[PDB]
Every structure is written in structure tokens, then in C-alpha cells.
Structure 1
Amino acid sequence: MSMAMSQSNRELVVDFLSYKLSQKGYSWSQFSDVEENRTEAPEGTESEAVKQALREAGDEFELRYRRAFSDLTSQLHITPGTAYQSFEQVVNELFRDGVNWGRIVAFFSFGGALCVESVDKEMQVLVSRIAAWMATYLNDHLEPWIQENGGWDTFVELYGNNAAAESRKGQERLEHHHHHH
């Protein structure tokens, strides 16, 4: 008997990773062929879920916790001889005190920095690794958690764009009340 999980989480590591990379100037990728059509009106077009949410939180994280993050990225020096263990360790402590969206996003970034550091050392080859190491920890040290707090749907409904605006809707309203009161 055996069993596994989904892949969504993994998609986050890739999508985000790329973002953290592009933000630094890097990128790298490839193309291919499949099969599809279209006939309406092409344009940027954007979503409004984990993708957008995750990113934002990431940028704001290093902003509010510029030090809390920096000091972290300096706690682990990824290398070819580095063992996935040395990784799951550092991330463990930062996650020792229970689990909360905050630490979650604050964590994701940790990895992003690792990649930025790898490329800086002309070792982008690592990116692929750290990327897999995350999807492994997120599915063995978070999955069970994220599924106990309403998955991501909740994270995007709390500390997310559509959510941010939603919050204001109320406030701007409440204030109007006391005023008319």
C-alpha cells in the first residue's frame, strides 16, 4: 500500500521562483508545441488567486521583515554538496512555532533567495533542485496544514488582492455609518 498528493503546491514553487528570478533580472526558459486556438481578444489578462496572492505577500515580506529574512537567507549556504537534510532543518526551526500563513509566505521567500544566490554564482542548475526540495517539504510539512485551514482559498481570501480591496469595502462603509449615526 502507498499514496501521494497533488501537484498544485509544486506549481507555486515554479511560478514564484521564476518571479523571484525575473525580479532579479534572470529568467531562462524554453518553448514547444501542443495544440490550441483562439478568437476573441488577446491581452495581458490576469487571475486573482494563489498566484497573485503568493507573490504580493512575498514582496511585502522582505519589506516588513527585511531583516527577519536577510538574516535567514544567511543561515543556509546552498551548494552542490549540500544535503536536502541541511535544508529541511533550517526551514524546520522557522516553522517550529506552529504554522501560520505568515511563516508560510515568509518561508517561500527563503527559497527564492537561495536561487538568486545560486545564479549569482553561475549555479542556476541548483534552481531545479531547491525547487524539488520545496515541493517535498510543502507536501510533507505543510500540505496537512494547508488542508486544515481551508487550503489556499483562505489565504487568498485573507491576505490577498481581491481580499485587500474587500476589506476596505467594509471599513469605508463602517466609517460612513458612525458618521451618519
Structure 2
Amino acid sequence: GPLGSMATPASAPDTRALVADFVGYKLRQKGYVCGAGPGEGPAADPLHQAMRAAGDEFETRFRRTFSDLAAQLHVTPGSAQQRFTQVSDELFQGGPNWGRLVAFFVFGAALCAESVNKEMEPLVGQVQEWMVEYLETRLADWIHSSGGWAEFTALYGDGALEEARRLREGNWASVRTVLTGAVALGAL
């Protein structure tokens, strides 16, 4: 054969692959459709199917998603990292539960979508790194000690039992509301 023995697999299903998945899938579905590739794969990984069900549920529950997206990019881009980092810290203040984990990725994924629809192409990768870095540096720790991404995949994945579902609901009740003041993206 031409290759194979001299070719190793690139990009494992790690956080980078997961962040590129959710954001890719979302962007590819509403913005970066021409750039088919990131969201070329569906929910099959032990985190993919988890985030997919998360975002979907939160996307339906969050009556304020694309608002802050416009609010931020209403004046001018670039200085979006400070806005993002502010709300991110407020989100990680004391409750990075799976209930909030949804909004964590959803915030950037939605942001990125509207960024590809506007003059914020380079900003997309920034939000992607701001997200993956904040996560890998602090979110991952909470996640690893809590139950892991696998726990989240069981919570709302194939084995999404009624107990796991009500668990997420009761969870976000105390966690998403305690950090509900992270609306620093709400500008004009």
C-alpha cells in the first residue's frame, strides 16, 4: 500500500474534536454550510450524542440565545474575548454542572454561527479557542471529578433514563439560576 504503515491517525475524539463537533455541526447547519467539514459527523462519540441532546434541549429552553450574539457584534468585533471571558467566569463561579455545560458550549456555538453570517470570520476561531481553553483548563477538572463526559453521555444519551433526565432538570434549577447574572453579553 502507498500509506498506512507510515500514517498515524490525526485528531482524536478529545475536547478539541468535541468542541469542533458541536460548534461545527451548528455552524455548518446555520452559517458555515459552504464550509462543510467540522459538522460533518453526527452524535456518535461518548460526548457528541451528549452535547447534541444538551444544546437541543437548552436551545428550546433558552428564549435568549441569538440576542446577545447580536448585542455583542452590534457595535464592533475583536473585543469579544473580554465579554466572553466575563460571562464564562461568572458561569464557572460556582456551578459548572451539566445543566450549565450546555450553555457553556451553546454560548460560543451560537456566537460562532452568527459570526460566520457577519464580518466575524476570524472571531469564530477565537471563540472556539476561548471556549476550549477555558474548558480544558477548568471545566475538564470539574467534569473529570463529577463523573466525566461519559456521565453526561449517559445522562441524555442512549441510556437517558427518567432519573437522569430529572437529575439534569433539578441540577440546572440550582446551577443555571445561581449564575443567571452572567448576562454581560446583553449590550445594544
Displacement of 1:45 after TM fit? Answer: 9.2
Match of 2:26 in 1: 20
**CA distance 1:95–1:114, shift in 2 (3 Å):** same
Instruction: Provide Cα deviations, 1:98-155, integer angstroms capped at 9, x if missing partner.
Output: 2210101122111011111211213322222211111110012211101111210100
| Distance in 2 between residues matched to 1:29 and 1:73, nearest whole Å | 22
Identity %: 50
Secondary structure of 1:66 counterpart: coil
Match of 1:34 in 2: none
Is 1:57 the counterpart of 2:54? The answer is yes
| Distance in 1 between residues matched to 2:110 and 2:17, nearest whole Å | 18
Match of 2:16 in 1: 10
**CA distance 1:16–1:157, shift in 2 (3 Å):** same
Match of 2:121 in 1: 124
Match of 1:93 in 2: 90
Select which of 133, 140, 163 maps to 2:159. Answer: 163
Aligned residues, how many? 146
Q: Which runs of 5+ in 2 are unaligned?
A: 1-11, 163-188
Secondary structure of 2:156 counterpart: coil
Aligned-residue Cα RMSD (Å) equals 2.9
Contact kept? 1:72, 1:110, Cα under 8 Å: no
Which has the larger Rg? Answer: 1
Under a length normalisation based on structure 2, what TM-score does the superposition of the two structures give? 0.66
Q: Which runs of 5+ in 1 are unaligned?
A: 1-5, 31-43, 169-181
Under a length normalisation based on structure 1, what TM-score does the superposition of the two structures give? 0.68
